[PDB]
Design a protein around this ligand. Structure first.
Ligand SMILES: [Co+2]
Ligand SMILES: [Co+2]
Ligand SMILES: [Co+2]
Ligand SMILES: [Co+2]
Ligand SMILES: [Co+2]
Ligand SMILES: [Co+2]
Ligand SMILES: [Co+2]
Ligand SMILES: [Co+2]
Lengths: 391, 391, 391, 391
């Protein structure tokens, strides 16, 4: 059982995906936002997220726009769901074919900022704390078409303005850049969690910025998602997280969480949940940015929504059991995992004391240490047995 | 023809690779270091680099070690070759099986630092300006075997110490971390140029740290090498560069520069040479970190060394011609490449002035703008025709 | 300049792609088929191809359908273009979400066969020689959802029937199966040229079936396209070929031919054209199944169509220069490329005679042989210099 | 617990890998073959396999070779282990740098065949029923270095001779070609199970030839291993199987079976054991071609050997429970998996009758069928809940 304390959130564009892929028409009808709110509340979600254009059709008059916001607001009220994050669609409309913030056309860049400021207003009105930015069209198909340096300057210029506004309007938002390596552009700017983190460090108010890494996005480059999250945590830049499944380097599948690389899904829950001193290492929403397979109907849709929660809770349960097992505890000791936490240097020791320590070099028996095993296969086998419910 | 001004450098371990691979014995006999200096001098190299263990066999007594250094310096002297960079082998010896700076074993970590300090002294002695650090054994095969957070702490602890020592001693070294996603470990820490840049920003004297990206390592994850270099230059962290060739995600091939992704090799040379003024955007060594194919004998080795320089100079020549062509200037103008360099905002404009601009949103005709083409294919076609010498 | 003897053909869906991708709306209006015929004739194509549904909108009444065909035939008549191949759309309509021929649903399988029979009729009437079969929806997202063996039985069962019909109606069609590893299904059946050839060999009239490999599809799995086509030719199963560009394992890009892996596009043209007896090893249509980038308008569309032709002809010209070069001739000899064509055994020798030859084993000096280099790097370097027009 | 009925086998080179990788020295001392026989027997293996050079050091005199073989045979006798398959090392020695059967050098091709003939004799004497052929060095790093067509001719030439010798000597061996896409050559000939199957079909006696696919090798190309295995079984060419783990496209990891893509390992075990008629679909050895991680000592080596067997048995148990679950059955029925096994055409129905059925076209409601969901997600969720031991 999922509790609001689990903080499971879903994008309106997830369960609402009509299943129109690059090779075929939609196989499902449109989902009414209000119905989505009731259905998610019902399956145990604590919040919902949306792109401006997911809730209000691109180009609605203010009268329509207003009406829709009012109804949505009611649904949230009745159900108790919150809106932890909002995002803006800077990829669908043809105007954004070369990007929003980094489009070579100056007018498109001005327009993309306006579109986002607007969405920031709605977000603040609904109580959202995080603005997610997915630069899906920022990038290129050909190297000579995009000056990357100029593009990074323009990405920065735009973000700096957004932070200025939020701070001045007192919205208290946090901004999360969502990395993706490719698709739809041949190559997208800020392709990995690493590139996104390095970029944020260059903004005017870096403390207001972090990343929203997605499971399948890092897997599209065959990277270890868990290891990348660990690095994001070390930097304290994990502001949000998108969970889903993928089968390596191919199109973005966005399967249910745990339906792609299952072993990494397991190490991931372990990392987020078995944080320092019992407590989770991460406190934000556990957001599912996935798609119900094109072969399913609305029944299949609700099923897949629940499978995400289910997968996360089954994995958590096994990660807990894994760590609580005295035999794992023994294997951890033998592999010296915790010894990495002890500083390499003694207290107050510097280069000179180290250079004078003959045991660290002159009298060190590299051959003898080189022969002891780490017992890593055995620890790994113990984890998988916990995952399989065999221990 | 290569000039010293071209700054082509080679690792002793490139031409000296005996071609012992993961599945077979060495097909070439050892290359003598003095001989290497002399042959490299002859093909046009301006400098040579080496790992400690490439020059002085692991465990050589001091008399021996001393002897080799003297001979080496004499060859340097006679040919006029310099040592722009040096590195340390923290991957071959069995003691380094779980890493050097981040081994679970505390004693290996202490010994790893001592091994590098020692190599710093020699680099300082030879006039080297950069210390390259390739953390090839830092990472894991299994997620539960390595605490990433603690590993980054210990990687940082070791680098802070290295910088302290260099600065106290007045060595003037710059430190360049070299990223690699995998091999030999299942996953290596700091897998891409981005991850390495983000990491470096967290050290005690960041100004002293940068990266040494390798063409093939970014390609092992299917990333755009030119595009990652552009971001590195934007951050001003491109301290050195390793040029070679690769065919996508598979084992590290280390082919001659330009023998893998030729189009990306072309866009890379254009980026480095057709810099800001008219001047190169990058002023350091053009280092070839490649391996002569195992099927080749020493004539093949020397041929492959020259091929590296030849590919660079041929691409440079076409990159220059590309930029000088009036038809290219016209295509650049139609694709609005330079328009990206113009700030999105007018001087003195903030969010208040932007919100007041009805033309940036309320009266913006997105449909009309979305219908004009960027002419990117045509620009790409002209570039390719310059590469093929078709124009 | 392109001549009709070059046999450049294009699908109506290539230049006609409106650029609606998985993440955005169409950026171009629909292309009139008659206009398409005219435009293509002007750029040098010798033929056009299409899916039933590209020409005649799904669900057109007889009258309309008839109407369309007649205008289409007129345009061909007027222009001199032929229809070398026709294919059927079994991927767009929601009914084919689980496949056409191997849908779990039997009624869909029966419907798919009917839909193809109809296209075979139109194809025969237009003079097409080849029926291309692209099983884009044949596959699965989940392993337990598709019995592969049963799917292969049903695939075979449908193809046997089509051959039967063609032969009885006297159409004289050849069938070409087009492999693709994934997209739109998580995994597609007959994922590579290899798997498709193996399958075809199990049909009732195997001499009527071959493959239609596409450059990008094999590259999506990081395979060597030229090498796979060389195997297809060895088997005599290259019934057709789709030329385009791709940048390794990622979504299907469908770039202009030679805009992806340039070195492999070069070796491919050399293989097809520099066939034995001076003559091309392949005599069918050089078909471009590519897509004008979404950033482009109709001018970029015709520009991209011409670029496909120009790329092929520039590569052809360099592949011939390469083979005609005496130094290449000398490098080929040193590499023993042609010695591979001489049988391993002397005429009349069998295992008995080989076992009696002490020189092949007992007295063989493996060590002296293993020390000689093949000069492959030098040969590669010469190929590339020819590609760069540097020789 | 493994029984001899489980038919688990290991190559001497698996537990015997000294862990010398491409970047480092061995971390383990050599394993005595007799000791390996005893240890394997002890963990439950029914057989052992080996390359000629694993047992008898390359270049041993006949007296030495004969002694090794005799001691070997005694161990086999005393433990009751058998030798189900043997193989030949055609990749280690420098002489094989351009391949064995397909080296451009004629004399190497002759020597390669004699090395294999000699191993067939020893195989036949130890009772081996399968000869595995892994052409690790047959391929190229550069496209112009190898005539593929000539290479396939030579490959075929060598294989026909081997079948001939075997048949004449009454050895009754079956031959299994083992595909691999790359490593150690840039591109290896016959890269996937598909390509090997298509090739085998062209030999003089195809019935004696099949494939020895390895889990990681197909995953190196990001292909679906279970799905390719399903196709191999449909062709009846699965003569042997190598089980291991891999994490997508990167160097060959050869991890314990199930430690790579766990979900694919689970569906593979289901396919092999839950064959048609209750019984397994495959009855050959379950061979582990893996390597104990370089971080391990001999304790870790035996732990990893046992992990392979444990992994197989755990997955088998879960696969069995999966299929005996009435809810799973119900989901299978709802997903129509079995309906694929029913011919598409009715008994005696031909194209004439198909064309006459208006229910297959004229009166087919594509739109209504297209709207029904297949329930695939739900089925996948039950599969994973079984693997997790949650059901
Ligand atoms: Co995604
Ligand atoms: Co996401
Ligand atoms: Co490398
Ligand atoms: Co390097
Ligand atoms: Co195609
Ligand atoms: Co394609
Ligand atoms: Co392997
Ligand atoms: Co194997």
């Amino acid at each position: 059982q999922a509790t609001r304390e689990d903080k499971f959130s879903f994008g309106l564009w997830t369960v609402g995906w009509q299943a129109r892929d690059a090779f075929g028409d939609a196989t499902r009808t449109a989902l009414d936002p209000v119905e989505a709110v009731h259905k998610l509340a019902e399956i145990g979600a604590y919040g919902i997220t949306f792109h401006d254009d997911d809730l209000v059709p691109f180009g609605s008059d203010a009268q329509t726009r207003d009406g829709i916001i009012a109804g949505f607001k009611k649904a949230l009220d009745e159900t108790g769901l919150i809106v932890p994050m909002v995002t803006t669609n800077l990829f669908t409309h043809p105007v954004f074919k070369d990007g929003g913030f980094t489009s070579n056309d100056r007018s498109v860049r001005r327009y993309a900022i306006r579109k986002v400021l607007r969405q920031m207003d709605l977000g603040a009105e609904l109580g959202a704390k995080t603005l997610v930015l997915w630069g899906g069209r920022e990038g290129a198909e050909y190297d000579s078409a995009k000056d990357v340096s100029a593009a990074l300057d323009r990405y920065r210029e735009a973000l700096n303005l957004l932070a200025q506004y939020s701070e001045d309007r007192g919205y208290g938002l946090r901004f999360a850049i969502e990395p993706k390596p490719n698709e739809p552009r041949g190559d997208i700017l800020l392709p990995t969690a690493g590139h996104a983190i390095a970029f944020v460090q260059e903004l005017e108010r870096p403390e207001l910025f972090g990343i929203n890494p997605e499971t399948g996005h890092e897997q599209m480059s065959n990277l270890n998602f868990t290891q990348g999250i660990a690095q994001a945590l070390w930097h304290k830049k994990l502001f949000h997280i998108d969970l889903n499944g993928q089968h390596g380097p191919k199109f973005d599948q966005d399967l249910v969480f745990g339906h792609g690389d299952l072993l990494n899904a397991f190490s991931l829950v372990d990392l987020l949940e078995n944080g320092p001193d019992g407590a989770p290492a991460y406190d934000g929403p556990r957001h599912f940015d996935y798609k119900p397979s094109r072969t399913e109907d609305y029944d299949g849709v609700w099923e897949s929504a629940k499978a995400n929660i289910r997968m996360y809770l089954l994995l958590k349960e096994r990660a807990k059991a894994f760590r609580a097992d005295p035999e794992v505890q023994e294997a951890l000791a033998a592999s010296k995992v915790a010894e990495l936490k002890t500083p390499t240097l003694n207290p107050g020791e510097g280069y000179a004391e180290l250079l004078a320590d003959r045991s660290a070099f002159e009298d060190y028996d590299a051959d003898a240490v080189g022969a002891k095993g780490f017992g890593f296969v055995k620890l790994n086998q113990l984890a998988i047995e916990h995952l399989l419910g065999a221990r």
